[PDB]
Ligand binder design. Structure first.
Ligand SMILES: [Mg+2]
Lengths: 287, 488, 345, 130, 182, 183
RNA sequence: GAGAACAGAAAUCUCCAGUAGAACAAAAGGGUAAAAGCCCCCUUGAUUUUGAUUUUCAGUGUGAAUACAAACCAUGAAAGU
RNA sequence: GGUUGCGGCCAUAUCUACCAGAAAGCACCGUUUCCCGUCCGAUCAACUGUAGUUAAGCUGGUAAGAGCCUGACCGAGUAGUGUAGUGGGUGACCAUACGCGAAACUCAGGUGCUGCAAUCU
């Protein structure tokens, strides 16, 4: 009956958009190490992690239609495509979709020095907790490529947005650091992706409210090299960054009282020449 | 659902900025700080740095030679217990803590079937929180296994409402008073009635009071004092079950009777008079107090808690020999009694005249202080386990806190929407559970003078609430006929 | 009427946290005269009132002892209650009480002048009906009608004696029953007082209400622009109301008609030095969004309004007074000899 | 009935006006409009603020302020006007009775139905809809 | 033990997303993949940034309710949660705004005429000549009564009524299609 | 809180969630019951209740509630019961383990619609029947019934009870002592 | 496919297969699994009240619809839906 | 290393045909007074661990079994495609680079690991 109507409504756009779903497409040339890296990375994206059933021959820079079709069919605004080649090894292409139309694309290649979760210290992790972010390097806030990388990673890993957060949920922090500052004419430094488990200890340098924080890396450790980059048009940028929109001298005072200001103007009493009453005049006297 | 007004855009912009870092680099005090005992002793104007609470506790411990933590309070204005270093001679006032922490109660356990009528009274066993007895409209009384939350050893033999139920300080005998003019003693571990029901009263029993252990003869069993609506009180010997002395000085119904630690008995009656009786003098009145305009309701004493749990403590450890039990009870009584540096006990009398009076019956016959400000009658009053504060319940939906040392008003615990019937203090004195005619129970924290948590779930009015000696469990009973147990 | 779970439904349920927050806000929030209320945000104020008090009104003694018990054929009250515990205390509390009573009697007798009536047997003449105005039923009904029909009430005051003309009686009702009504003051007749006097008056009265100074005349005037701007701002505040009604409250002959006329910059309302020129309210439109209303002069009855005080105000027409001669000492007291010596020969 | 034709002008032949001769609730921000605009007239003397509500349980009855009128039968245009018209359901301030639903959400308001005809009585009586 | 952090450039925080931005200079040689101590420097920098972020987050006000479990959505009184402000970083939306508009040819007339919207009371309607309400629609609707009744005085007229209902439904569907065409 | 029932044993474990796999914070098994004196019926209703109480009290003690901690209070340990493929039937010993854990201090949100003695005619739980089930009342009743029935079954069934010289009231006493020892 | 009095090529039952050539509202990515299918138990909702668009003729500090949000509701032991 | 519980990867984990499993624990099994549900105590609920069985489940070993998976200059930096120039060709096209960039096929290998709690000759 109307069972699918609820699913369509969920897929339908809203003033407050649902949590973006991530779709991981295994490429034709995807290797075992690349598959393991993708699985480890997506483990942090749960419960918004989706894996395709079969390998797909996808050429995003030659034809973007397959990505749009996959996003439309799966309603996944975030997509990551695995790719491996002699020139571009372990190429993990990230794709964003705006209304099923490709927003931007950026190719990231994982260096061979990657470390998987199994190789790290035997420590646990909590699934579904919102990760903390720490961006290092001025290029993130100034370089267009690193600005796009920061925005994409924030939209990908931030999870659901909430105005109220629990302290117990701050179990791990995701850190992205640039491999040193750079100027024009130099290759883009690789972005270092690190995830650290948080530990709390007594400091005595401010009390309980300022506990000492220690870190324990759990990974997955990945070094991303910037490959081909695609950017949206200014019109699409403006459309995506658009508040839903869903007053002067009016303030909702505490308790909900609606108060309005009067804002009295200045009064110049130098004007208003006093009536020249016969009493004030000194022309008449009887002393 | 009416919602609090949302923050304005200016508020959001202000909150978006970082601020309020607690670095507190040096915070060297501008004025020296000295330690003085809250009770009488001044103990020394030091000028330390930003010493923490642990450092202050260590300093006090090494001053006392115990290096027994004490709670540090500032000058009593500020009246705020580095906590006080933000406001700036400065004197820090400390009181013994009797280290213990009752975990806040925030959840119930289950709704237990039982008496086919409203619950009337309840009382946790002084030695263990696993056993508890509830009196209800049904003629039968039932002891509840607080662990499994199931009935056990139902008491039968009464034919009228079980108005009041009390547990002996030794924990070996339970005394139940019913609307019928009889009192029955039951063995907690079997439910059998200890001999024939106590008889001789002409009207229903209003309250029961057990003789304190520290005053009882070594090896003997404590006596049981009872009050009746006829205005008479009988001191029943639990061994012979015969009232040795009958007192009828009160001209109207006796509201309640309290057995003091000094051996005197203080009772309130409908005659608007409070009378002090001495058991030693062949149960004879010694003094009469006449200040209440209306009848006196629910007379209470500072030592009531220690006398009730005499020879026991929150740990639940039982004494080995009667002499050891008597010594422990005497020590517990003296701890609260000697807080002033001298053996004294305070008495608070409540009445329907919208006023409560503080008395020292042994020291003087005049009221020490007058507690006033309530809009309606004060239903219930409960002295703190250490006498630090006095709390009273009134029909005006308000609960007020008063200083136990001099009766001065402290704060009002607002939040109730109906008449408050009775309240019970926590063993550690930190929390205070309360019940009202409304559908929900409430518990207050004296430290912050703020509501701790609301405990809804009762289907009707709740008339009974009690806190266990160990503080682990809190029971309740009301017109819903369902007994509810609450614990952390 | 169709049955439904609503009606036996839950509508306005509130939470404890909201109640605590509103209780804290009640004591934290403070009002500013420059700000006016627009919406009260309907709230369970009953659960937030009943602040701390230390009076404990007298207990119901009747419950403990009925009327018959206290006195009557039975009269079981054979003894006094809580009487002085000692004879010395009784003497101490009675000897001084006698002196206090004698002193109070002397203080009361210092005033009595009814003693002359008691002794000589004469009586004061009947109060003239002219001195009872403006207190008729019709004028007060018109005042209430304009108050209810005005979203904002503009109160005019006489610079000579604004405090006496304040007529607090109406203002209390305005504040209590109709908080949304601004009840803005206006200091009229500022041209007949020294500039420093008017400045001090506005400074001292601005702590509660706007209290804009004004001089009313169809010809050259003062404050017309400021008052027009204030009215335009108030109308802008009620932008969605589609209109705003403003009513002029004040004592008779206080210039309300003159104020409206100068606001209109032409003769609109009848004006005369004699009070009571305006007998019924009238609607006048300016700016197409705000309508001016002028009600008759209203005076609140009070025993402290002895005819001498009323007459020196513009309340009563001096034509109908029986003995105008006896009031000259009052005008002498109220005015310096220099001013009369200049005006009067 | 309940709509008395009111005639205005020197020659009373253009009434165009209606007056509600029955008790009505007019909210808190009533603020009569200009004479020329008002057609339906509800006199202040007929405006009720507090209604007498009887509690079906406990047999207790309290005088509580009226909050709003939700459903008046017989052309609920009268509901919009806020007329009582015995048989109407009106909101009442139940905070005084201290009714608390499960979960600690104390109820300060609830529906009530007027049981007496205010036209012939100087008071409003309603039965609380528990 | 130390928890205070000092940097040449203050750290820019984004509390709405639990994110912190550090613009301080980074040494290329130290972070080079060939460096054995590469991991240690990144770990220390991340530790400092996380310490600053945690201090800022704990500096925020936190809610403190006094209710019970009750509705599972609300937080218990024991719990206290930091009130994170609205996000400061702007992120692109995944879909365009759904603010499509169409008057359906009915709203235009309703605005032109003085036709106020119906109060939308409910389905219940009194069915005269019977002691039951039988709402207008929703269940055992009175509109179906003509089919179940026994005599239809003045081809079966019940079939005619059913055909009329079908025609009205099809007309409504056609109007919906016409409005969708716009 | 994962509770699973196998032949001759009961498995109860408090389990968290992690990407690498579930992690157990505490565990308890019915085979440890003999440590408290319970030698028979390790997979029965009373044994399930005892195991639930034991695991609840053990995890409560390990967590520091008895005998990043900032932002008081102690935040009691709330846990959701998981029974896997076990059928949802009123009176099942899995609900007995749930009740034992609840009595032990683990506040699992649960209604009393499936505890033993819950009748469908009246929406009220019979506390007497629940107590009897908790204290092995049904086992004692069965032993009493067999005391006058065919002895061959009584010699095969409850053979351990006869070897240990157990009786109707002794079973309840042993269960109470085991609960005390667990506490 | 293997077997069962009437009963056979199609009647109903038992067993082994069935990636699903089950009914899934959907075409369809090809999806949906101890289900979105089949069997059984409980259930009303067009519930109110706050906020931004629309309307008017006592512009209704609310009389109503629309969207959002919050209480409330159904179910289960629960997570949750 | 075997095993039970909870899981991650989700066929190197599956399907057909054959063989073994010391101790422990799974598993079958024995019972219907109680809680519990079915036409059927078959399923499920409860009791028993007592009367047994490793037959079966499960684990393990084998087939050059079917499928499945992995590394690869093997296809290959090849094909294909794209962008540029009076280079030849009247043009289309041909030769070059200049950026993306395949797959079949083929060579070789393999037929489960792993996270936490507990237990076993
Ligand atoms: Mg005049």
């Amino acid at each position: 009956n109307a069972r699918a109507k609820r699913a369509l409504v969920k897929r339908e756009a809203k003033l407050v958009e649902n949590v973006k779903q991530a779709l991981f497409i295994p490429g034709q040339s995807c290797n075992k190490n690349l598959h393991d890296i993708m699985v480890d990375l997506s483990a942090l994206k749960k419960p918004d992690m989706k894996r395709f059933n079969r390998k797909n021959d996808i050429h995003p820079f030659e034809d973007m239609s397959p990505l749009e079709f996959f996003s439309e069919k799966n309603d996944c605004s975030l997509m990551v495509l695995m790719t491996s080649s002699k020139k571009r090894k372990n190429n993990m292409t990230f794709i964003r979709t705006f209304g099923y139309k490709i927003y931007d694309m950026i190719e990231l290649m994982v260096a061979d020095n990657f470390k998987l979760l199994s190789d790290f210290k035997k420590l646990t992790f909590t699934v579904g907790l919102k990760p903390m972010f720490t961006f290092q390097g001025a290029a993130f806030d100034t370089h267009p490529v690193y600005k796009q990388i920061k925005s994409l990673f924030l939209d990908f890993f931030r999870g659901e947005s909430t105005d109220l957060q629990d302290v117990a949920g701050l179990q791990h922090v995701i850190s992205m650091t640039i491999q040193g500052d750079f100027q024009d004419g130099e290759p883009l430094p690789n972005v270092l992706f690190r995830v650290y488990k948080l530990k709390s200890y007594k400091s005595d340098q401010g009390g309980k409210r300022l506990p000492r924080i220690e870190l324990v890396e759990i990974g997955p450790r990945l070094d991303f090299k910037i490959g081909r980059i695609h950017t949206p048009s200014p019109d699409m940028v403006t459309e995506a960054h658009k508040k839903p929109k869903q007053k002067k001298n009016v303030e909702l005072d505490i308790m909900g009282d609606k108060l309005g200001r009067i804002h009295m103007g200045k009064q110049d009493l130098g004007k208003l020449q006093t009536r020249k009453m016969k009493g004030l005049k000194s022309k008449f006297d009887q002393g | 659902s009416t919602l609090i007004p949302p923050p304005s855009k200016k508020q959001k912009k202000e909150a978006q900025l970082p601020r309020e870092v607690a670095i507190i680099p040096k915070d060297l005090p501008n004025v020296s700080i000295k330690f003085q005992a809250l009770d009488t002793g001044d103990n020394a104007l030091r000028v330390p740095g930003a010493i923490s609470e642990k450092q202050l506790e260590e300093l006090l411990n090494q001053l006392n030679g115990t290096s027994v933590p004490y709670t540090f309070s500032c000058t009593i204005k500020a009246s705020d217990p580095y906590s006080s270093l933000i406001k700036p001679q400065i004197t820090l006032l400390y009181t013994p803590r009797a280290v213990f922490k009752v975990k806040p109660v925030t959840r119930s356990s289950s709704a237990i079937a039982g008496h086919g009528s409203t619950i009337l009274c309840s009382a946790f066993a002084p030695h263990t929180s696993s056993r508890m007895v509830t009196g209800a409209g049904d003629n039968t009384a039932r002891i509840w296994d607080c662990d499994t939350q199931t009935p056990m050893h139902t008491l039968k033999g009464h034919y009228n409402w079980v108005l009041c139920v009390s547990w002996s300080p030794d924990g070996e005998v339970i005394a139940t008073g019913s609307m019928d003019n009889t009192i029955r003693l039951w063995d907690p571990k079997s439910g059998q009635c200890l001999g024939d029901a106590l008889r001789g009263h002409s009207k229903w029993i209003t309250s029961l009071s057990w003789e304190p252990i520290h005053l009882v003869k070594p090896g003997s069993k404590p006596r049981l004092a009872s009050s009746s609506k006829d205005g008479t009180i009988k001191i029943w010997d639990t061994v012979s079950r015969v009232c040795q002395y009958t007192m009828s000085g009160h001209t109207n119904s006796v509201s309640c009777v309290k057995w003091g630690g000094q051996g005197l008995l203080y009772s309130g009656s409908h005659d608007r008079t409070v009378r002090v009786w001495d058991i030693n003098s062949q149960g004879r009145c010694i003094n009469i107090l006449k200040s209440h305009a209306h009848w006196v309701n629910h007379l209470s004493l500072s030592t009531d808690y220690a006398l009730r749990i005499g020879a026991f403590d929150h740990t639940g450890k039982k004494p080995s020999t009667p002499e050891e039990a008597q010594k422990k009870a005497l020590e517990n009584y003296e701890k609260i009694c000697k807080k002033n540096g001298n053996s004294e006990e305070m008495m608070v009398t409540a009445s329907d005249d919208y006023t409560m009076f503080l008395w020292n019956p042994l020291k003087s016959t005049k009221p020490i202080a007058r507690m006033t400000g309530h809009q309606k009658l004060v239903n219930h009053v409960a002295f703190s386990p250490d006498g630090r504060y006095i709390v009273s319940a009134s029909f005006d939906n308000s609960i007020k806190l008063w200083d136990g040392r001099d009766g001065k008003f402290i704060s009002t615990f607002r939040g109730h929407v109906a008449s408050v019937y009775q309240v019970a203090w926590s063993s550690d004195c930190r929390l205070l559970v309360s019940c009202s005619k409304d559908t929900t129970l409430k518990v207050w924290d004296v430290r912050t003078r703020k509501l701790s948590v609301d405990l809804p779930g009762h289907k009707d009015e709740v008339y009974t609430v009690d806190w266990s000696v160990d503080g682990k469990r809190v029971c309740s009973g009301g017109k819903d006929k369902m007994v509810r147990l609450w614990t952390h | 009427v169709q049955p439904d779970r609503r009606w036996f439904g839950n509508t306005r349920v509130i939470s404890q946290d909201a109640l605590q927050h509103f209780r804290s806000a009640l004591g934290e929030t403070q009002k500013d005269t420059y700000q006016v209320l627009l919406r009260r945000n309907k709230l369970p104020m009953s659960l937030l009132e009943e602040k701390d008090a230390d009076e404990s009104p007298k207990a119901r003694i009747l419950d403990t002892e009925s009327y018959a018990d206290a006195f009557g054929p039975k009269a079981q009250r054979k003894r006094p209650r809580l009487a002085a515990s000692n004879l010395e205390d009784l003497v101490k509390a009675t000897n001084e009480d006698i002196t206090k009573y004698e002193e109070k009697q002397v203080l009361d007798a210092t005033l009595g002048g009814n003693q002359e009536d008691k002794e000589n047997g004469w009586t004061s003449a009947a109060k003239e009906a002219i001195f009872s105005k403006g207190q008729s039923k019709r004028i007060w009904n018109e005042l209430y009608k304009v108050i209810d029909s005005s979203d904002v009430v503009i109160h005019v005051l006489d610079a000579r004696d604004p405090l006496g003309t304040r007529c607090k009686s109406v203002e209390e009702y305005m504040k209590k029953e109709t908080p949304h009504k601004h009840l803005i003051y206006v200091l009229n007749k500022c041209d007949l007082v020294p500039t420093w006097v008017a400045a001090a008056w506005v400074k001292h009265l601005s702590k509660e209400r706007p209290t804009l100074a004004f001089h009313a005349s169809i010809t050259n005037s003062f404050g017309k622009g400021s008052l027009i701007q204030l009215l335009r701002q108030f109308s802008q505040l009620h932008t969605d109301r589609k209109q705003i009604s403003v009513g002029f409250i004040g004592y008779p002959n206080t210039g309300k008609s003159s104020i409206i006329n100068t606001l209109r910059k032409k003769k609109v309302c009848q004006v005369a030095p004699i009070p009571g020129e305006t007998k019924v309210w009238q609607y006048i439109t300016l700016m197409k969004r705000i309508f001016l209303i002028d009600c008759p002069g209203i005076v609140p009855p009070s025993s402290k309004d002895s005819e001498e005080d009323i007459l020196f105000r513009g309340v009563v027409r001096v034509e109908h007074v029986t003995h105008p001669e006896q009031y000259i000492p009052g005008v002498l007291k109220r005015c310096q000899v220099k001013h009369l010596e200049r005006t009067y020969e | 009935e309940m709509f008395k034709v009111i005639k205005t002008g020197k020659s009373r032949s253009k009434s165009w006006k209606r007056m509600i001769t029955k008790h009505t609730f007019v909210g808190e921000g009533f603020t009569r409009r200009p004479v020329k605009m008002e057609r339906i007239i509800r006199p202040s003397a007929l405006r009720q603020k507090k209604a007498n509500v009887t509690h079906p349980e406990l047999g207790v009855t309290v005088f509580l302020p009226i909050l709003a009128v939700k459903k008046n039968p017989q052309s609920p245009m009268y509901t919009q006007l806020g007329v009582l018209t015995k048989g109407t359901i009106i909101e009442v301030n139940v905070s005084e009775l201290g009714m608390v639903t499960a979960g600690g959400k104390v109820v300060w308001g609830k529906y009530a139905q007027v049981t007496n005809e205010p036209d012939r009585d100087g008071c409003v009586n309603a039965v609380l809809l528990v | 033990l130390p928890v205070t952090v000092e940097k040449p450039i203050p750290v820019v925080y984004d509390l709405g997303n639990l994110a912190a931005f550090d613009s301080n200079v980074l040494d290329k040689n130290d972070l080079d993949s060939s460096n054995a101590r590469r991991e240690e420097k990144i770990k220390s920098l991340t530790r400092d940034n996380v310490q600053l972020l945690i201090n800022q987050l704990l500096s925020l006000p936190m809610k403190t309710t006094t209710e019970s479990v009750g509705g599972t959505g609300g937080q218990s009184s024991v719990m206290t949660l930091l009130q994170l402000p609205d996000p400061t970083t702007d992120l692109p939306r995944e879909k365009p705004l759904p603010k499509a508009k169409a008057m359906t040819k009915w709203e235009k007339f309703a605005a032109k005429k003085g036709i106020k919207p119906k109060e939308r009371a409910g389905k219940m309607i009194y069915d005269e000549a019977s002691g039951e309400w039988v709402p207008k629609w929703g269940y055992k609707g009175a509109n179906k009564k003509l089919d179940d009744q026994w005599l239809v005085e003045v081809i079966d007229p019940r079939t005619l009524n059913r055909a009329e209902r079908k025609r009205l439904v099809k007309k409504n569907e056609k109007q919906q299609r016409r409005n969708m065409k716009n | 809180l994962v509770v699973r029932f196998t032949n001759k044993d009961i498995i109860c474990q408090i389990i968290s969630s992690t990407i690498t796999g579930d992690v157990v914070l505490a565990a308890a098994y019915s085979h440890e019951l003999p440590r408290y004196g319970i030698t028979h019926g390790l997979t029965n209703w009373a044994a399930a209740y005892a195991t639930g109480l034991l695991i609840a009290r053990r995890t409560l003690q390990k967590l520091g509630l008895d005998e990043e901690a900032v932002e008081d209070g102690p935040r009691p340990f709330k846990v959701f019961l998981d029974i896997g493929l076990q059928r949802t039937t009123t009176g099942a010993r899995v609900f007995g383990a749930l009740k034992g854990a609840s009595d032990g201090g683990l506040y699992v949100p649960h209604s009393e619609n499936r505890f033993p003695g819950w009748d469908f005619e009246t929406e009220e739980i019979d506390p007497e029947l629940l107590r009897s089930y908790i204290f092995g009342g049904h086992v004692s009743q069965y032993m009493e019934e067999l005391a006058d029935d065919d002895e061959e079954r009584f010699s095969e069934l409850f053979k351990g009870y006869l070897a240990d010289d157990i009786d109707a009231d002794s079973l309840e006493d042993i269960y109470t002592s085991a609960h005390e020892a667990i506490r």
